[PDB]
Amino acid sequence: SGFRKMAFPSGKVEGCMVQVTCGTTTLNGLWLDDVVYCPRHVICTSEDMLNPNYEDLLIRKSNHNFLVQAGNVQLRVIGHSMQNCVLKLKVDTANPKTPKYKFVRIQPGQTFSVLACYNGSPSGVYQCAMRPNFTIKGSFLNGSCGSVGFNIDYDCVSFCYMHHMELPTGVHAGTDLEGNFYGPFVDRQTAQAAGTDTTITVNVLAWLYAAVINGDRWFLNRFTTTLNDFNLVAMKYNYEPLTQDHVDILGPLSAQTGIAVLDMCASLKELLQNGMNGRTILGSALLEDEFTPFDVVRQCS
Amino acid sequence: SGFRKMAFPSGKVEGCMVQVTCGTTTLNGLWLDDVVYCPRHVICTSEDMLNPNYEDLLIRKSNHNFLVQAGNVQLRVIGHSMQNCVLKLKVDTANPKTPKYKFVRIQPGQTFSVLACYNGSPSGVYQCAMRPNFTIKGSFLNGSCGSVGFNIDYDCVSFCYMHHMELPTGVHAGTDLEGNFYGPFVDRQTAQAAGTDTTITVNVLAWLYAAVINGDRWFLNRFTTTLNDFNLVAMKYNYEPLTQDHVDILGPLSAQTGIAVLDMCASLKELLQNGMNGRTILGSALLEDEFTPFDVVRQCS
Ligand SMILES: O=C(c1cncc2cc[nH]c12)N1CCC(=C2c3ccccc3CS(=O)(=O)c3ccccc32)CC1
Ligand SMILES: O=C(c1cncc2cc[nH]c12)N1CCC(=C2c3ccccc3CS(=O)(=O)c3ccccc32)CC1
């Protein structure tokens, strides 16, 4: 038993991390087959980022201006184009360590593992969730651009996130592997800001089910409440609305503990109105919304 | 910026996890060179565990009673011996993916990454700290025995933990890779209980430093204090004593933030005596003690 923020094993992704250097800037790239993916802002100076015409800046770049280094073997760039905000550098060597992979665009609320890398070398791995405002609360220092987020579904690695930037509030924004930013953010130095975040309600409920499975049961009561009257309480405390799809998703968790989904919502109602009163749930004094229902089933059985 | 529980990349360790089968029991083994390491309770039936004589039980097992499977590659066992509480199966094939490794015995308060495995296949990775009572608050299910804990010092993997059992309180106990249990626990079905746990003071201080590095300064005060005056408050709240060695370790962190250790101690003293008043630090409403000063420096720079 026990419940931890658990990342996927990073081995299959470590073998795809390379170093990409453009002039004086070094960041991380993702080497899949004969392509290296990285954030396009590698080609920008600090002056360019005030107002970058990326099409024009990339035109001033030649194939020989990009230095890709896989460990100690230099990969020769034979082609470069721009797909949205990612730069795809075609190289003369297919990665022999290329796993079965897929590029996916996740929805807010879903989670993924982050392989934080610096200079093409992995530094650590941790779990993140796409927030409702399309940011992630990660751990990224300078040099970490190009680090990727992923899930391992069956035997296939689903890449979903590539790190691009940190916002003034300390949260992080990036794109999918086709170059499309999650959210309204852009890769330039402007006054962009993360909108008001909300709590992922279906995730908190799955975490409470994880708490019940692991013995923590003090917050359970005999009350109940309709889906409509719970959402009224959820709006005042900045929680996402709970839909019937959400209740269907929580089916396996509800059917496992014998506690109905709506009965769990009544317990969450009481925790929001009163608080925890100095108690803890799964070692936490706050309600945790970064575990999807999939994450709980994968870890609790 | 940002601060997350960050595990080491697990790729080097994944290539060493194998499946060990003895009769109807299957658990995980560690394949380094031509030796496979796994818990010795693999040879035991449920009835054996009430009072196991491991020398006698191993005496009736032959080499052919042990099946080792590295994925789909069967490794034939040519030798078996018992070192303390671990079984060493000598196999006919050296592991071609063996990394530069070392067996280390960590001290209470240190942290490590855990690669949770089932049937020789990795499931996930997360960070754990050796508690002062020599337990860990991990996430393990049935079949996870033989999963290992490790740190990655330079290019060398320092194996420090192998999982053996879950205690009644939901915490977990295991051995080092030489078979010696952390703590007083034994691999038999008896009334085992973890001792009183305490809070790792030097880790909380490093964490508050991490918080200051991240911009959380609301707890910083104008008052200072002394070591004995701080330890007096620490002893009342189940906190481990603060030594000068601890203050030496907090050198780089104190020398980087501008706050002195004793000045951070007075801030912690006030947090213990008064509480956090519903405020949060680094997204937590509780004081965190599972980050060593090394972990903070590695992550914050
Ligand atoms: O390396 C991190 C990094 C990544 N993640 C977290 C942190 C924390 C500190 N640095 C971090 N860069 C922050 C994001 C970067 C840029 C950028 C790109 C090219 C040239 C200059 C700059 C500086 S820019 O400010 O104009 C800016 C503005 C908007 C979007 C991107 C960028 C690169 C460095
Ligand atoms: O697979 C997990 C496992 C590992 N980690 C967490 C969980 C949660 C559920 N199961 C978990 N085994 C629990 C630990 C085990 C044993 C054991 C070993 C051989 C034969 C029987 C038994 C059952 S025993 O109870 O007599 C016992 C008592 C003391 C020490 C070890 C053991 C094996 C299964």
Question: Explain this structure to me?
Answer:
It is classed as hydrolase/inhibitor. The entry lists the keywords Protease, Inhibitor, Complex, hydrolase, HYDROLASE-INHIBITOR complex. The assembly is dimeric. SARS-CoV-2 Main protease bound to non-covalent lead molecule NZ-804. Chains A, B are 3C-like proteinase nsp5. The first copy, chain A, has 301 residues and is α+β, with helices and mostly antiparallel strands. Chain A folds into 3 domains: 1-14 and 100-197, Trypsin-like serine proteases (Thrombin, subunit H, Beta Barrel), CATH 2.40.10.10; 15-99, Thrombin, subunit H; 198-301, Orthogonal Bundle (main proteinase (3clpro) structure, domain 3). Chain A is 23% helix and 27% strand. Chain A is built from 8 helices and 13 strands. Chain A has a 7-stranded antiparallel beta sheet with strand order 5-4-1-2-3-7-6, with no helix packed on it. The longest helix of chain A has 14 residues, at 261-274. The A-B interface holds A 1-12, 14-15, 115-116, 122-126, 128, 137-141, 166, 170-172, 214-215, 280, 283-286, 298-301 and B 1-12, 14-15, 115-116, 122-126, 137-141, 166, 170-172, 214-215, 280, 283-286, 298-301. The complex binds ligand A1AFE (2 copies). One copy of the ligand O=C(c1cncc2cc[nH]c12)N1CCC(=C2c3ccccc3CS(=O)(=O)c3ccccc32)CC1 is lined by residues 41, 44, 46, 49, 140-145, 165-166, 187-189 of chain A.
